[PDB]
Each structure stands twice: as C-alpha cells, then as structure tokens.
Design a protein around this ligand. Structure first.
Ligand SMILES: OC[C@H]1O[C@@H](O)[C@H](O)[C@@H](O)[C@H]1O
Ligand SMILES: [Ca+2]
Lengths: 6, 617
C-alpha cells in the first residue's frame, strides 16, 4: 500500500 | 493464496460518512492507508451496527480469504465480529466465514474454502472496543485465483506511446498513434507520434510524423480501396493525411470544408469517404456532411445536416455529434445506427439527403457504445451511456437487420455494463466486446471491465472470457489480427496522470484452443488470389476440405469508432482439384466495400486458418 497522510 | 488484483473492483456500503470526513466505501480499494470507509455518523442519529461493505469484482473469481486493514489514526470503528458472504449471480448469497477480530491496528486475515464469486460482502457486527456504533476500514484485499479461460492472454507488449488510435496493415503489422506527445495531447502542433508493431517478431518501430502538418489525435479514420488509410481532423481539425503501407509514410491530403474532431469517417461503395459530426475540434456545431474523392477532394453535402445524428447529451453539441455509428449499405447508401436513439438512411448523391429509419427499439442514447457488422446487413450494438461524461453505462445490446428493411430487436444484456469498450467481429460470426467501464468518466480506470465477453448470433448469449491484466477505458483500442487473435491496447493519454497505458495485450479466442489448453490444429490456405473484383468467382486451395470461408474487412479504430470492419461469410463450391474451392464475391460494393480484406478458412469445428490478404476492387 501507500499513504497520503492525515 | 496471493491477493487478487483489484482493477475494476467497485465498493458499496449500507451507509457511509461524507459530511464530517471522506468516508466513502471506495476508499477501501484505492491502496492508500490514510483513506477510510467509515459508517455514517452525522447527522445524529449515527447509523447503528451492523454495517455492510460489498465488493463487486466484475468477474467470477475463486475466493479463499479476505484481508482487513484497519485505520492507523485512531481506534474508532475497528471491526470486531464479522461475517463474509459470496454471490456469483448477485441475488443468492452464501456464508463462508464468521468470527471476531482483536482490538488492534494489525491487518487481519480470514481464509476459508475456495468459492466462486463475483461479490463478497463483509458484515461488521461489533466495534472491537464497543466504543460506538461504528465500522471503518482503510483497505480490503481478497485472496484466491482469477479465472483461466476460456481463451488466453499474452504478456503485455511494450509501446513507446499510448496507442489511442490503431490500424491493421498487410504483412501482419499494426500501425498505432497518439498525439504530438507519447503521453499527452493539446494545441495544433501538426506532429503525431507513431509506432508500428511487427506481429511476427514483437518488434516496434517509432516514428514522429511531421511532414503533413497534422496532429492526428481525435480524428476520423477509414481504409481506402487502393490500400491507403485516410485520416482527417483531430487536433489539426482541418487536415487530411493518408498513410501508404507500401512506403510506411504519410502524405498530405486536401483540407475539409470545416474542421472537426471526434467525428466518424466511412468509406463508401464508390471508395469515396463520407464524414459527419465532430465538434470536439474546429468549432461548436454545424458539422454537416461532407464526402471526399481522390479527384475532387472534400465536397459539401449541405442537405445532410448533423441535426439527425445528435444525441441529447448534457454537454450539447460538443459531445452530441461525436462518434456516429456509420455503415456502408447495399445500393451505395450510408446507414446511421446510433449512438442517438434516432437512426437514419443517408444518401450521398448531389447535395445529399437524410431519411429517418425510426428509433433503435427502446434503446436510450448509447454514446461511446459499439456497433459491429457480423454478417451481411446484420449489426450488433452494445454498451454506451446516455452521456459522454459522468454517466451510467448500460449492459443492453440490440440487433439491427438492414436487409430490405430495418428490423431492430433487443438481445441479451452483457454480464457487465460498459462505456468506452471496443467491439470486434470474429471470423466465426461471433462478436467480442473488450474493455470499457461501469461509469463513463474519460481518463479514469475506475470500474474498468476486465473480462471480455463473446456474443454468439446462433443463441444470442454472451459468454465471459478469461480476464486481461490492464484496464482499457477511454483512449483504448482493440481489433482483429490476421492470425485470428485480438489486440487490445491504450488507455489514458493524460500527461502527469497515473492512468497512462503504454502497452497492449493480445487475446487468443477460445476457437484456437483445445480443452487441455494446447493449441488447436488449424486449417491452412495453400493458394489464393491477392486481388479480386466485387462479383468475381475466385479459386482457393486449402490443405484440407473446407466449405466455409470468411472475408473480414481490415480495421481502423479510435475512440470506440470502427466503420471499416465487417464479416462477409461465403459458401465454397467444390471443384475437381485437391481441396480447391470456388467462392463468389457479392456484386454489391455497398456490401462488399472495397479495401483490404483478410480471407479466413473455417474448418468443421469452426476453427479458422491464419488469414491471407486480398485487396478487393
Ligand atoms: O465520532 C465518530 C468519528 O470520531 C472521530 O474522532 C474520528 O476521527 C472519525 O473517524 C469517526 O470515528
Ligand atoms: Ca484506502
């Protein structure tokens, strides 16, 4: 997966 | 089990938050650990447990497990008690597993006995900390194995551009092109990136075409009697360019009377090229009929007005005149089948004329659907959406018979709805549908349909084929090859976007395979004429006794439009020679439209030979 952040 | 690929998967739910954060079901499929499905909590009252999340896979996979990835930001909505259901048909459901997950941030896994399913439903019964009436998920994966067969796919084939337009050349080569750029478009730069794939060796030659001052993105295409390919309009909306397969180069043609883009071009019984519509470029509206001849260039047909072909597109004439379903018909006429509800007969003599053909039964407008001529005067239409943009696609299919009349009937729905798909007439009379998506948004891969389907006129049923690996939505192409396989490529062409596909794959249809997956022994053509005349008797030698042949006109294709292909089945008469037969070509050039054809021998099991090229005058 990946992440865009919060 | 490894995880299944999720291209084309669509997630829906009982309830979801959108007011206080982005809690859409679709966030479980995007691959981002930061985006969630959250149950609806605002306004009060929050939606109560249980909550459900359903996944439509687009295909009947084998499912053996599920992976749940919780949010990482807090604990709210971590699933505790869970249930897993599966359906193959959508209506009947079956429990495969039921359990509880511990209250932590660890990705959870559940495995069960393999089950055939298109749909998987996760019911959340409890919130693992009983903190509130909430369910949430960052990601959902599924374990198992995809269908193999019927048919088979090649590995992907590298291209140096997104192949967004394509044409079949003799010698088993495929011309493709994009725009001024391999991966984007715009302006009117008068340059087109091209690439020819050699189907024998897998080699690709790349050529920038600048000599004709034409960026040939978004045009009309057709095959001329003499072998050339005429390409008009697009980013340079007034230009005409002709490709010669002898020289493999382009030559400037004369300008159209009005520029156009996203129009439809169709070679007529006389080898002239008729064109109608196309407001994508060159101005909005008034994109009336024209016709090209090699001696006189483009002449206007002011009594062929565009009004007759316009859909009720919400975008107006910018879209509503796009991609008409145009066909050469017996007698030298042109038939308009759609995508508008309204169908027409077009005549090209003089200033031209349009006669209404009545509607296409009860079809809605079918923009970006396909129309395919699978026999003499017989067409199959399928897919499309009432709108070009942000519009629900249909699964409906309608047959149209234009032999001595117009007779429309609704046939079987496809197993999936499609817009942006491609249609391919196959030599056995069946029609392959490839690609598309569930909801038409140009430049997306969301809801891509990954499994082609095959329509058999004999029973009017659709059968799902083994799925492909790359989504093929907007700016994709597919077409028949001379060995009887089908090329599929393209998709995207949107610059810094993440949905460019600079590749293709090649589909081997079921008719070439044994039950065991070994290659079927094929009939062979030993001798045949390289040229012929409409109305001629011709002589063909096969390597075994054959009585059915198919003349399949060669294709050009872009933006879902292919006016070139058509199947003309011929019955062989036996002669005195060793598996040598007579075929009689139809005399009517409205039906036997002049141009390059692939001649196929059809064996008694309906396995086809490799075709040979015959140029018909
Ligand atoms: O009140 C319900 C909401 O509570 C917030 O704290 C949380 O960040 C949201 O994802 C949702 O759980
Ligand atoms: Ca996510």
């Amino acid at each position: 997966s990946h992440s865009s952040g919060a | 089990s490894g995880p299944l690929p999720r291209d084309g998967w669509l997630a829906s739910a009982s309830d979801q938050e959108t007011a206080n954060e982005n809690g859409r079901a679709a966030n479980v499929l995007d691959g981002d650990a930061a985006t969630l499905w959250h149950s609806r909590y605002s306004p009060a009252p929050a939606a109560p447990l249980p909550h459900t999340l359903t996944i439509d896979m687009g295909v009947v996979n084998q499912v053996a497990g599920l992976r749940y990835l919780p949010r990482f930001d807090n604990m709210n909505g971590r699933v505790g008690g869970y249930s897993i259901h599966a359906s193959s048909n959508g209506t009947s459901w079956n429990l495969l597993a039921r359990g509880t997950w511990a209250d932590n941030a660890d990705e959870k896994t559940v495995t069960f006995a393999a089950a055939s399913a298109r749909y998987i439903r996760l019911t959340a019964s409890t919130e693992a900390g009983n903190r509130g009436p909430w369910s949430s998920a960052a990601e959902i994966n599924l374990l198992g194995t995809p269908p193999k067969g019927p048919g088979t796919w090649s590995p992907t084939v590298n291209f140096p551009l997104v192949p967004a337009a394509a044409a079949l050349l003799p010698g088993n080569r495929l011309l493709t092109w994009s725009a001024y750029s391999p991966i984007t478009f715009g302006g009117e730069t008068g340059i087109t990136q091209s690439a020819i794939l050699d189907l024998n060796t897998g080699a690709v030659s790349q050529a920038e075409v600048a000599n004709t001052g034409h960026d040939m993105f978004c045009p009309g295409t057709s095959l001329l009697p003499d072998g050339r390919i005429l390409v008009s309009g697009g980013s340079n909306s007034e230009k005409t360019s002709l490709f010669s397969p002898a020289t493999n180069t382009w030559a400037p043609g004369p300008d159209m009377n009005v520029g156009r883009g996203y129009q439809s071009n169709v070679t007529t019984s006389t080898g002239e090229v008729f064109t109608l519509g196309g407001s994508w470029s060159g101005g909005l509206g008034s994109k009336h009929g024209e016709i090209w001849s090699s001696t006189g260039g483009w002449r206007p047909l002011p009594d062929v007005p565009v009004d007759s072909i316009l859909t009720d597109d919400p975008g107006g004439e910018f879209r509503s005149d796009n991609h008409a379903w145009l066909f050469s018909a017996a007698g030298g006429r042109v038939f308009h089948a759609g995508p508008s509800r309204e169908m027409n007969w077009i005549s090209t003599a003089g200033t031209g004329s349009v006669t209404s053909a009545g509607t296409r039964a009860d079809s809605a407008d079918a923009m970006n659907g396909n129309a395919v001529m699978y026999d003499v005067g017989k067409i199959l239409t399928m897919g499309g959406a009432p709108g070009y943009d942000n519009s629900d696609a249909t699964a409906r299919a309608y047959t149209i018979d234009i032999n001595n009349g117009v007779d429309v009937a609704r046939t079987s729905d496809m197993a999936v709805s499609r817009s942006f798909a491609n249609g391919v007439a196959l030599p056995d009379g069946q029609v392959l549908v490839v690609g598309g998506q569930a909801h038409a948004v140009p430049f997306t891969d969301t809801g891509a349909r990954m499994a082609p389907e095959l329509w058999n006129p004999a029973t009017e049923e659709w059968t799902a084929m083994a799925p492909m690996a790359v989504p093929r939505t907007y700016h994709s192409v597919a077409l028949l090859l001379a060995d009887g396989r089908v090329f599929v490529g393209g998709g995207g062409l949107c610059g810094t976007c993440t949905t460019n596909h600079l590749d293709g794959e090649i589909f081997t249809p079921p008719y070439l395979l044994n039950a065991d997956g070994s290659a079927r022994t094929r009939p062979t053509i030993v001798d045949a004429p390289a040229t012929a005349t409409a109305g001629s008797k011709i002589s063909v030698t096969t390597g075994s006794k054959i009585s059915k042949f198919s003349l399949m006109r060669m294709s050009s294709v872009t933006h879902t439009v292919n006016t070139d292909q058509r199947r003309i089945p011929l019955t062989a008469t036996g002669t005195y020679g060793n598996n040598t037969a007579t075929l009689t070509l139809p005399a009517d050039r409205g039906v036997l439209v002049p141009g390059a054809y692939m001649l196929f021998a059809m064996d008694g099991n309906g396995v086809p030979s490799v075709a040979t090229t015959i140029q018909i005058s």
